[PDB]
RNA sequence: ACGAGACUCUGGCAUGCUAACUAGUUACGCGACCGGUCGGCGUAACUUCUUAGAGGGACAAGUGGCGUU
């Protein structure tokens, strides 16, 4: 019987997502940031919010939490998004192409390309899961 | 001489007045050795005298705990003994002696010094007692 | 909007006077 | 540069380096605070049996202490608490002696100047009042010195006329003289707010920042901006050392130090084993203490272990 | 109810109970805004009044319950700290200058 | 009725309409061949080394 | 060191089963000079499951609720069990208590069948912690069955309680109920 | 949005009450006896019990296991 009520969860997530720089692994920091901006008027509530921010910090070192968004994690993810590989994946020297798509390319006036490699197709013609 | 450690078990009214002399505990006029219950004597006399009799000659303590009930002043006397010894050796010997005497008094008692707020509980209307009602419904 | 007949109807939507109140409310 | 090795393991403490204003002191007896509702001490034995033995427990306090300082003489001291009690502790017997209220609001530390005659601590309660060891308020210091929440005011052991400065959590820093009594300039315009910073004891280069770990150095000579340099992570310790031009920031797993040669990371000189207290988020730093001889360094952590740089070459 | 809403209260409910139409008695209530029914913050955050009105048919009971705003004397504005309920006071964020060079006097 | 230091690596939990019966899967220390599942009353924690007294007549069902 | 006078020692207990290290707590710091020092195990998050044998003897004897009123009586009967078993056996009372309860008691005690059972029982491999604790429970309830409501002179009733609990005389009623339980246990076999 | 929770009162927890003639008490003036009848003027420091009388914090600066972690 220790399920954190939505009051605690919302307050803790808002506090963490907003002023994570001031928030480490403690309680008085949370009570201070409360009494500064969004003051909470009780004591057991402040203890439970400190406990939930502690738990969320324990779960946030291993990875980004679903309900929170720091500038740090968003920054890391946008740097990963902006990643430009040195060599393109589509820049292959040789591309394997089946005879049917080869004929299709020939019909598109693209049969004179030299970067293709006609690959022998499947010997058999079975591709379905046995019914049952 | 002020050590400010006391000894308090349950709600017994106690006094720990410190001034140099032998360590003696007076209970209903009966000192530490000859005790009022007359049946829990070894459990209180074992820790101190087996190590030395002059051991308590450091600072005399007026311990006049007007305790009623045997579980009240019994183990309150040992609470007082341990607390007075630990505080005297804390403030007035040195830190290393603090560490060793705290180690021996903690192997004496791991963690049972201080309790939670609880006592005999209140009574509710509709029944004779705290958790009980009138005639039964089978 | 007339509220007297509305309250009289809302007190009992299927009473003795329900038909007259509903008819008066229509128009 | 320098070659350093770590000798002796820490096994008998739970405290930190929380806030010790730089003050000359003997290399044997050191003082500090903690978050264990107690005041801790530092006795040097240079032995593996105990890396540090507290001297005496200055008991009588019911709260944590956010600021404790002993002066050159053991009979002059200052302290503060979360509620703000200013208690006078003697080191001879480890007992309190006198009681006042020092911190109107829990502040990082008390202010210091080259005169050491003004006792004013930061307050968020908007009820600034003068403190005096005598107990008499000669004049109320109310305006032109602390416009907003002031973070810390550093010592000024300089060879010139006294200039002191007040740093705060509101993107501000104020100059202050006892021969001026006026506000010359006031700076503003940081990207993020402040946690704790240092300043020049001679009022030449003011270090600000901490929302990202950068030390922005203002010039107080004309009140303009000098430059901004990069330091460590988000911490309340961006310490431009007065003894060393070196920049020290305990970030990630290392005390990254930048030298005057290239202002980059050159030496780690770490000989410390791992611990379970570091398996969580990497250790940060809160404050640093430097010896008056420019030889010894004491750095804290959130790792519960206190790191020391000592020049012994054992 | 419209008066109370225009008065500044963030909730009111009024109940008129008894005979309004017919021989039998109806309990008719209107509630708007918010209204706490439980806990301690119903004494210092809710005002309740019970009154009786006579009629040729009988007596009608009037129960009026009103919510109060946060700060005393009807939400004058924030004052010395006496917190009593949850609130998210969001101040204006810091703004940086767009121009590459700083202020010149 | 074999006697051995049974290395328990499988304790599933309690089941029964009186709720004191835990199902322990007694596994032998260095056998890795046979295991027995038993309904027994009392706290038999995960990882403990049981005293082997009987290796048949498993927890009965139905 | 700490001992019992200049004539008795308390460091003569070594079983070496390597199985009493998960529930019987002797590992790190659970040692006491005190047989019982006002435990607050109720307020703890079920931190009462590493309880030793002497406290089981302390807390598992009283019939109904007709002893409570002063834990003075609990600690006094702990002390007098100490001394009386010492007088009976001439050595460490706890050591011979363990010796005379292990050699008997629950080999496969009362435990139900499947999801619900009251017709018969199951011959259950009794865990060492619960076997030892329930054997001490057997001795305690046999002590309050024989020493209490006895038709003879009560200063040897602990000797005859030991006889009933280990040797197996047809005197104690609890031992014949346990005999029926053992008959069920053999019905399993 | 109401209810639940939070909230309020209440319970074997405090070495600050610049705190008390009802409760003992550092240095006075009582005092056989191996610094006390200064609680028998009244200690201006008190405080430990009492005042549950007023201001406080400490389930996560925790560990192991189960659980979609």
GROMACS .gro file of N, CA and C (backbone and C1' of nucleotides) in nm, chain A residues 39-42 45, chain E residues 10 36 40-42 44-45 68-73 75 80-87, chain H residues 6-8:
model
  102
   39UNK      N    1   0.494   2.611  -0.415
   39UNK     CA    2   0.504   2.569  -0.276
   39UNK      C    3   0.398   2.465  -0.245
   40UNK      N    4   0.439   2.357  -0.179
   40UNK     CA    5   0.346   2.256  -0.129
   40UNK      C    6   0.327   2.278   0.021
   41UNK      N    7   0.205   2.265   0.072
   41UNK     CA    8   0.174   2.314   0.208
   41UNK      C    9   0.184   2.211   0.320
   42UNK      N   10   0.234   2.090   0.296
   42UNK     CA   11   0.237   1.990   0.401
   42UNK      C   12   0.377   1.928   0.409
   45UNK      N   13   0.362   1.509   0.240
   45UNK     CA   14   0.364   1.528   0.095
   45UNK      C   15   0.505   1.560   0.046
  621UNK      N   16  -1.452   3.008  -0.654
  621UNK     CA   17  -1.426   2.904  -0.753
  621UNK      C   18  -1.517   2.783  -0.735
  647UNK      N   19  -1.500   2.081  -0.227
  647UNK     CA   20  -1.448   1.969  -0.150
  647UNK      C   21  -1.553   1.926  -0.049
  651UNK      N   22  -0.995   1.785   0.624
  651UNK     CA   23  -0.993   1.910   0.700
  651UNK      C   24  -1.022   2.033   0.615
  652UNK      N   25  -0.964   2.050   0.494
  652UNK     CA   26  -0.987   2.176   0.423
  652UNK      C   27  -1.128   2.189   0.370
  653UNK      N   28  -1.225   2.159   0.456
  653UNK     CA   29  -1.364   2.194   0.433
  653UNK      C   30  -1.416   2.290   0.538
  655UNK      N   31  -1.192   2.558   0.669
  655UNK     CA   32  -1.129   2.684   0.632
  655UNK      C   33  -1.125   2.707   0.482
  656UNK      N   34  -1.195   2.626   0.404
  656UNK     CA   35  -1.203   2.645   0.260
  656UNK      C   36  -1.345   2.635   0.205
  679UNK      N   37  -1.378   2.910  -0.107
  679UNK     CA   38  -1.306   3.034  -0.087
  679UNK      C   39  -1.173   3.030  -0.161
  680UNK      N   40  -1.125   3.143  -0.212
  680UNK     CA   41  -0.994   3.145  -0.277
  680UNK      C   42  -0.881   3.135  -0.175
  681UNK      N   43  -0.758   3.137  -0.227
  681UNK     CA   44  -0.642   3.096  -0.148
  681UNK      C   45  -0.610   3.195  -0.036
  682UNK      N   46  -0.601   3.324  -0.066
  682UNK     CA   47  -0.542   3.419   0.026
  682UNK      C   48  -0.651   3.505   0.091
  683UNK      N   49  -0.631   3.552   0.215
  683UNK     CA   50  -0.746   3.594   0.297
  683UNK      C   51  -0.817   3.717   0.244
  684UNK      N   52  -0.938   3.737   0.296
  684UNK     CA   53  -1.028   3.845   0.255
  684UNK      C   54  -1.055   3.840   0.105
  686UNK      N   55  -0.895   3.666  -0.167
  686UNK     CA   56  -0.786   3.663  -0.265
  686UNK      C   57  -0.745   3.804  -0.307
  691UNK      N   58   0.248   3.738   0.328
  691UNK     CA   59   0.339   3.663   0.412
  691UNK      C   60   0.301   3.515   0.412
  692UNK      N   61   0.398   3.424   0.412
  692UNK     CA   62   0.368   3.282   0.385
  692UNK      C   63   0.278   3.221   0.492
  693UNK      N   64   0.156   3.187   0.451
  693UNK     CA   65   0.066   3.101   0.530
  693UNK      C   66   0.005   2.998   0.435
  694UNK      N   67   0.085   2.902   0.389
  694UNK     CA   68   0.036   2.808   0.287
  694UNK      C   69  -0.081   2.725   0.338
  695UNK      N   70  -0.180   2.705   0.251
  695UNK     CA   71  -0.294   2.622   0.287
  695UNK      C   72  -0.340   2.527   0.178
  696UNK      N   73  -0.292   2.539   0.054
  696UNK     CA   74  -0.335   2.449  -0.052
  696UNK      C   75  -0.232   2.448  -0.164
  697UNK      N   76  -0.243   2.347  -0.250
  697UNK     CA   77  -0.146   2.327  -0.358
  697UNK      C   78  -0.166   2.433  -0.465
  698UNK      N   79  -0.056   2.491  -0.512
  698UNK     CA   80  -0.059   2.591  -0.618
  698UNK      C   81   0.073   2.588  -0.694
  973A        P   82  -0.360   1.015   0.329
  973A      O5'   83  -0.316   1.159   0.279
  973A      C5'   84  -0.191   1.179   0.215
  973A      C4'   85  -0.187   1.311   0.141
  973A      C3'   86  -0.206   1.435   0.225
  973A      O3'   87  -0.089   1.477   0.292
  973A      C1'   88  -0.347   1.447   0.038
  974C        P   89  -0.093   1.510   0.449
  974C      O5'   90  -0.226   1.595   0.469
  974C      C5'   91  -0.237   1.728   0.420
  974C      C4'   92  -0.367   1.791   0.463
  974C      C3'   93  -0.395   1.788   0.612
  974C      O3'   94  -0.328   1.892   0.682
  974C      C1'   95  -0.587   1.716   0.497
  975U        P   96  -0.241   1.858   0.813
  975U      O5'   97  -0.349   1.853   0.929
  975U      C5'   98  -0.430   1.966   0.957
  975U      C4'   99  -0.546   1.929   1.045
  975U      C3'  100  -0.513   1.860   1.176
  975U      O3'  101  -0.473   1.949   1.278
  975U      C1'  102  -0.690   1.746   1.068
   0.00000   0.00000   0.00000
